[PDB]
């Protein structure tokens, strides 16, 4: 009924598919990819219809997740702050379709909704429990989670605790060792825990005031054996081992720590007024940060030193959200109006530092040390949003006009750490005034039902994302390698237009869905782009187009003659991106992907299973200038086509105990995902400092995942 493409996965579906990270969440979503395989920083984030990075609005309970951050080989943070084990559902929206979400959802939005006491407490009972134990063979990871919810008088409470402990996600390369000859995944030790607490008061009918507490800590100790013996030059060591045995990077060990703490208040109630029938608001405070610690034996020919690096990227967020719902009728049309405000107060800090100690004498090495440096002047970003949306029903038509006004103000704060960055480079030109942006983003959706089975829809939406502080103020000079990074204080915000139309058909014997989209991007921000020694500067791509077609379908085979419960389904996604400034393709566009399934479900749901077949085309349209091959050699690697088989099954051992099992990569095929390959080396610095054997970025071989869920 919604005039847009949105995919929802419930808590039960996540348990069925053994979803332990967002990479496994998008396994069978053909138009969404998650990268980061083989990278030190780990899982990067979502790629929706060729759009990834900070242009995807990732939020949990309305609170936006931190953006990416790259500041060299020892400073790289991704967007992996959410544990999928604490959500009741996840919604993937494509494009800035909704006015209720922020306009910075250029490529789409991924929304997480945490578990509520209602979905834990059984019907007819006042207390509930949920114990889960799971194992994943791909990363040798164990999961243990426990959730308890209760309902006493007019108060409801929920307490969730989960703990993960595992290792690195294995690749399908069969050679270990060190250097570029290592095709196995770098060893890792990953520990994670997540704490969720809710306490609500149901003081009236349709009214609830609640408290939310949330903590999440992820600790990964990595051994970058693939980087031993570096640096490398076009796939070969820069310094021959005959003269420097072991290279300049004798060994490199690291630790990445992710943290998210969130405290929130939410309130909704029913009102008898002419302005609204239902009002909800929430106030949240979130502290999310990433800590990268690097240790290495550094041997720059003349001296042996222990070189350490520390990087912290932190975001403190205050967000107030509101939404007032009013229902009324004007003549033959029924109206459903939703309006409100959204206030954001964001502080972003980034710090880099390092030390150097001589391994022969024990003395300090100032040449190998780094003082505390800030890449941006600790900005304070205030966002004010006003939105209104009306759902108008007239006969079989449904019109959804929308408006969202966004106001963004950024306040720089010059500190001594940032002044040091202005000293490292010879660029001391910084503007201490405030930068302001504002825009009205219209949105329109139309739905029409006909022939008792079909639905036509059209969607028009606009997106708006303001520049970040790193692009506006980041500066760095490398006289040794002959390049520098210039800030772009005149960078313009992104403007996008989304056009989408489609046809849906619902039957008792199955359903289908066809979608065609056309997205135009104006002033597409290309951070750290190489101009034309060398200059890296964030610039605006004036025009960019991404278009494609998505196909969905499901057939109930029992109606055509088959055992009841047997079904088949398919999902095919195609995209086409072009940079209209230079005519080059957009490398973030995934190849033609299709997922086909043959599944069975028992009549009472006691057991069932699904056989999945994923077919992906070979990548063809590649921009050679902006694509850096992971191995660094002259030849550029394009991912081939492949087909893989996966089998999921589920059995109810008891009325409370359910066993979910899944076998992946049945034929044990060595294959690559394009998003992992094209995203490994974003700027080209990794080709020399942390290269990847092409087999180390391959997907895991034959593996299984099993979990046991006890709903007491």
């Amino acid at each position, epitope marked *: 009924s919604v005039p847009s493409t949105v995919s929802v996965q419930t808590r039960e579906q996540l348990d069925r598919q053994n979803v332990n990270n967002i990479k496994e969440l998008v396994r069978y979503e053909p138009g969404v990819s998650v990268g980061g395989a083989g990278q030190r920083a780990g899982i990067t984030g979502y790629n929706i219809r060729g759009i990834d990075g900070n242009r995807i609005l990732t939020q949990i309970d309305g609170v936006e997740l931190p953006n990416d951050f790259f500041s060299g080989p020892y400073a790289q943070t991704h967007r992996n702050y959410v544990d999928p084990d604490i959500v009741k559902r996840v919604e993937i929206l494509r494009g800035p379709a909704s006015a209720l979400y922020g306009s910075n959802a250029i490529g789409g939005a991924v929304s997480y909704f945490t578990l509520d006491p209602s979905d834990i407490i059984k019907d007819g009972k006042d207390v509930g429990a949920r114990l889960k134990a799971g194992y994943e063979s791909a990363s040798h990871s164990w999961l243990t989670s426990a959730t308890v919810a209760g309902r006493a008088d007019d108060f409801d409470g929920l307490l969730h605790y989960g703990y993960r402990q595992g290792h690195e996600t294995e690749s399908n390369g069969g050679h270990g060792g060190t250097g570029l000859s290592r095709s196995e995944a770098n060893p890792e030790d990953a520990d994670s825990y997540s704490l969720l607490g809710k306490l609500g008061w149901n003081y009236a009918e349709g009214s609830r005031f609640g408290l939310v507490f949330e903590k999440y800590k992820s600790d990964v100790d990595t051994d970058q054996k693939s980087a031993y013996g570096g*640096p490398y030059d076009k796939g070969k060591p*820069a*310094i021959p081992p005959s*003269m420097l045995p072991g290279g*300049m990077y004798q060994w490199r060990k690291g630790n990445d720590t992710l943290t998210r703490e969130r405290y929130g208040l939410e309130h909704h109630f029913l009102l008898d007024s002419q302005v609204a029938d239902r009002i909800q608001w929430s106030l949240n405070y979130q502290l999310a940060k990433t800590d990268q610690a690097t240790r290495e034996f550094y041997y*720059p*020919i*003349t001296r042996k030193v222990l070189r350490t690096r520390d990087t912290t990227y932190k975001e403190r967020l205050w967000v107030f959200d509101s939404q007032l719902d009013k229902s009324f009728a004007i003549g033959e049309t029924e109206h459903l109006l939703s309006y409100g405000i959204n206030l954001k107060h964001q502080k972003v800090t980034g710090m880099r530092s*390092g030390t150097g100690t001589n391994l022969d004498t024990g003395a300090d090495s100032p*040449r*190998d*040390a*780094l003082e505390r440096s800030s890449d941006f002047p600790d900005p304070t970003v205030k966002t004010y949003a006003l939105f209104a949306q009306d759902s108008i029903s007239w006969n079989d038509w449904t019109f959804t006009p929308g408006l969202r006004y966004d106001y963004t103000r950024m306040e720089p704060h010059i500190t001594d750490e940032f002044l040091r960055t202005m000293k*490292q480079s*010879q660029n001391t030109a910084v503007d201490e005034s405030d930068k302001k942006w504002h825009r009205v983003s219209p949105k329109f959706g139309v739905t029409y039902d006909f022939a008792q089975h079909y639905t036509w829809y059209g969607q028009y939406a606009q997106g708006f994302r303001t520049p970040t502080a790193k692009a506006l103020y980041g500066r760095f*000079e*490398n*006289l*040794q*390698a*002959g390049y520098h990074i210039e800030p772009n204080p005149n960078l313009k915000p992104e403007k996008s237009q989304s056009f989408e139309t489609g046809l849906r058909g619902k039957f008792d014997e199955g359903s289908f869905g066809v979608a065609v989209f056309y997205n135009k991007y104006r002033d597409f921000i290309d951070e750290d782009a190489l101009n034309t*020694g060398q200059t890296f500067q964030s610039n605006n791509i004036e025009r960019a187009v991404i278009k494609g077609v998505e196909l969905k379908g499901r057939l109930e085979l029992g109606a055509f003659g088959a055992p009841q419960g047997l079904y088949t389904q398919g999902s095919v996604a195609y995209a086409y991106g072009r940079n209209k400034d230079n005519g080059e393709p957009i490398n973030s566009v995934n190849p033609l992907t299709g997922v086909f399934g043959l599944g069975y479900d028992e009549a009472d749901g006691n057991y069932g299973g699904l056989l999945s077949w994923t077919l992906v085309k070979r990548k063809d349209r590649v921009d050679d200038s902006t694509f850096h091959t992971p191995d660094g050699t002259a030849s550029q690697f394009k991912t081939p086509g492949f087909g893989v088989l996966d089998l999921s099954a589920y059995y109810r051992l008891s009325k409370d105990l359910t066993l979910n099992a899944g076998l992946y990569n049945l034929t044990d095929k060595k294959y690559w995902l394009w998003d992992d390959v094209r995203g490994y080396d974003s700027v080209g610095e990794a080709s*020399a400092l942390a290269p990847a054997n092409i087999d180390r970025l391959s997907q895991p071989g034959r593996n299984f995942a099993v979990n046991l869920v006890w709903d007491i």
Partner: antibody
Amino acid sequence: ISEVQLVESGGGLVQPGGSLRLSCAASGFNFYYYSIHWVRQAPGKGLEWVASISPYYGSTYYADSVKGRFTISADTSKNTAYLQMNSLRAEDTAVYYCARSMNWYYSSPYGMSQGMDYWGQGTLVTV
Amino acid sequence: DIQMTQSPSSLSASVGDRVTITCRASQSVSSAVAWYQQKPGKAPKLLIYSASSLYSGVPSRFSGSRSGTDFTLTISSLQPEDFATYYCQQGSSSPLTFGQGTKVEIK
């Protein structure tokens, strides 16, 4: 402790207007990622930078006083730098030094490497 | 293009004295200024690089400083082996420019 050893050769009495080739053999680490510089000192005068070669980028640089007449090249297989001097004048007589820059491609930018830390003994060219 | 004016051209100095050699640039330049010591009949030896950093093995008597377009080389306690000619060199990458040179003699 001693990364490279630089030795110059090819210097001597060339009659004015003639040609002469100077070679700079390096013993030790290869200077493919470094910069090799030629510096000459006329008798009783100061140091004057004349040319430079960066093998990694393939870039060559020259002073105005020697532009067009001098050619600088490198081998990177013999670890030897060459300075082809043509149309020599009486003002070109000096002691030509071969020097290697401290800064190189993979040096840490926080190390602040700058200048030439290794020099040859020099060869006398008399025009 | 850029010029480095080094003053003085000669310093009469006594063992134990503190001497200062100043090098002034003709334009706006970065900190890429190096200092060299040359004795007669010998190749130049690098002492200070990046206008402040002491090269490994060079005695701590030598020191570098910067003030705008003026660069300073200082010897806190002159010693008998420090009587030579000193040159300031400007530039991180080519082209490079050397100073006129300052000869330090015995007072």
